[PDB]
Amino acid sequence: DEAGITGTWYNQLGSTFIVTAGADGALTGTYESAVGNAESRYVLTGRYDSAPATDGSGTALGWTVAWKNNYRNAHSATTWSGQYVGGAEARINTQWLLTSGTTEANAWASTYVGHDTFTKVK
Amino acid sequence: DEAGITGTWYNQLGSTFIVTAGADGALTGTYESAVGNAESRYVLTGRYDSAPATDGSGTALGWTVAWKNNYRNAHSATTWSGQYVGGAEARINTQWLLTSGTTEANAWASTYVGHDTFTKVK
Amino acid sequence: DEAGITGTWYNQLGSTFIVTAGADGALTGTYESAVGNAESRYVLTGRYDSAPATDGSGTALGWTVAWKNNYRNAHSATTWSGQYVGGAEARINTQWLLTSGTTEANAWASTYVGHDTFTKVK
Amino acid sequence: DEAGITGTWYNQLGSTFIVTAGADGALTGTYESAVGNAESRYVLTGRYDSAPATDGSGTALGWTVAWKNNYRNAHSATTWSGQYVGGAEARINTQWLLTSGTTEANAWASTYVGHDTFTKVK
């Protein structure tokens, strides 16, 4: 799956996820969001299961973006948790958590939840 | 918050989170879970907002563990998304998503959600 | 949207959501799941915003099923939280939480998270 | 657990949850939020497992509030998904999803996720 995961992915929002999968389970790359308080590329790092099951199961993985770069700081971080599913129409199916820095009074409303589906075309 | 985040953290379950914060926004270290299909330490990587707001808000961060090491492989990955809050009773307040690799028939039940509070003592 | 919400809805798994929207903001009906520890219909109840914004926003709603009926008891409950979007291809876009009754030792793993999209055809 | 669940509950934010558990698995009552775009009481409805496991497990339940009443309309709905744990320090441990009505361009940011713990005192 190192080969499978490594490359350029796109989600349903038109965001771009550029990733390299290391032999050691590492994910490194950049994320470009089409929405929200974001412009240009942000560093991402993550992990994946480098010895997945042989029973037709997907490959668990996840990664993080902190929404600071040379242009903008959105004082937030998203984590994607999902699985990679190989084959002619390869997908990464994720759910995510976006947390903002907040005061203790607003901490109840700190975290958004959603879902992103990444494909190799779009 | 580089100083504040770097070190050993403990959650409500007895898990141990050993992290270094980089000047560049990186998180690197190891995670040892007190529960589930886990033994010994697992690599983690993540990101944090290295220039947080000065209005008394927390510092957004996240990280990932893939549940594979030299002892076990749980074919799963957890991402934590949260904020660091400083001061004498410093805390990392997180929500997490744990995704298993599944077949497509079982993909609806792939992902658990929970919440973990990390402190510097116990 | 009382008229628009009331009726039979189908999700991407083949599940059947039969609902009546009350003028008072009540949702009542039955849920038949195509997957998991379930057979036949289960009672559902919920609420919706009966005076939504007129700026082209969706209508917020949610409901609960407890997975007990005369055939089976899965010792669990799912809540759907979402919005109704009207028009030619009407949808209810939801995220859900499924909690099982658990011992205190397994309560970290009590809750699944997912997402369901309901349409009037399928 | 009909008797255990029925009554007045309070969460860590100082919100008030007034519920009646029906023999039929119904939950009905009122919710008063101490935070957000809310004042006074809101209708709630939900479900619980009225025949839980006898092995020490918690009792699965969930409920919904639509944030409209005679005073305000926040064009939103929260669903709590959780379990009732009986005894001298009785608890309802929940995770919640708050969904706002949005335009389709803001729908990625429609949903908050958090966690509330309800006790009989405070």
CA C39 to CA C26: how far, in whole Å?
25
How many residue contacts between A and D have a Cβ separation below 8 Å? Answer: 34
Q: Which residue has the tokens 């919100």?
A: D15
Whether residues B64 and A53 touch (CB distance < 8 A) is answered with no
How many residue contacts between B and D have a Cβ separation below 8 Å? Answer: 9
CA dihedral D52, D11, B61, B27 (to 10 degrees): -60
Whether residues C49 and D111 touch (CB distance < 8 A) is answered with no
Whether residues A113 and D108 touch (CB distance < 8 A) is answered with no
- How does DSSP classify residue C101? P
CA D35 to CA B11: how far, in whole Å?
26
Q: Number of C-alpha atoms within 13 angstroms, CB side, residue D10?
A: 8
Q: Which residues of C60-69 are buried (b: 16+ CB within 10 A; e: fewer)?
A: bbbbbbbbbb
Q: How far is D11 from chain A (nearest CA, A)?
A: 12
Q: Is C10 annotated as a binding residue?
A: no
Q: How far is B109 from chain D (nearest CA, A)?
A: 16
Q: Number of C-alpha atoms within 13 angstroms, CB side, residue B18?
A: 9
Q: How many CB atoms sit inside 10 A of residue C5's CB?
A: 20
Residues of A in contact with B65 (CB under 8 A): 47
CA B113 to chain CA mean position, Å: 13
CA C85 to CA C121: how far, in whole Å?
15
Question: Do residues B29 and B46 touch, judged by C-beta distance below 8 A?
Answer: no
**CB-closest option in B13, B105, B110 to C108:** B13
CA C106 to CA A70: how far, in whole Å?
44
CA dihedral D46, D51, D55, D58 (to 10 degrees): 10
Q: Which residue has the tokens 């939801």?
A: C94
CA B92 to chain CA mean position, Å: 9
Three-state secondary-structure class, residue B30: strand
CA B68 to CA A61: how far, in whole Å?
11
Question: Do residues C43 and D61 touch, judged by C-beta distance below 8 A?
Answer: no
Main-chain dihedrals φ then ψ at residue B2, nearest 5 degrees: -50, -55
CA C87 to CA C4: how far, in whole Å?
9
Tell me the β-bridge partners of C73: C68
CA D70 to CA D62: how far, in whole Å?
24
Whether residues D46 and C44 touch (CB distance < 8 A) is answered with no
Three-point CA angle B20, B23, B26, nearest 5°: 55
CA A20 to CA A6: how far, in whole Å?
5
Nearest residue of chain A to residue C82 (CA atoms): A114
Distances (CA, A) of A111 to A22, A107, B62, B65, D45: 30, 8, 12, 20, 25
Closest CA to C46 of C112, C114, C94: C94
Tokens read off for B25 = 């926004």
Nearest residue of chain A to residue B25 (CA atoms): A66
CA A39 to CA A43: how far, in whole Å?
12
Closest CA to D45 of C44, C49, C58, C76: C44
CA C116 to CA C62: how far, in whole Å?
12
Count of helices and strands (H, E) across chain C: 1, 8
DSSP run (H or E) holding A4: helix A2-5
CA D26 to CA B38: how far, in whole Å?
39
Distance from the first to the final alpha carbon of chain D: 21
Q: Is B112 annotated as a binding residue?
A: no
Domains of chain C, by residue range, sit at 1-119
- How does DSSP classify residue C23? T
User: At how many Å resolution was this determined?
Assistant: 1.6
CA B111 to CA B96: how far, in whole Å?
10
Whether residues B100 and A93 touch (CB distance < 8 A) is answered with no
CA A66 to CA A43: how far, in whole Å?
7
Three-point CA angle C37, C79, A101, nearest 5°: 130
Closest CA to C82 of C35, C32, C120, C47: C47
What kind of fold does domain D1-119 have according to CATH?
Lipocalin (2.40.128)
C54: CB partners within 8 A, 6+ apart: none
Rg (CA), chain C: 15
**CB-closest option in A49, A104, A107 to B77:** A49
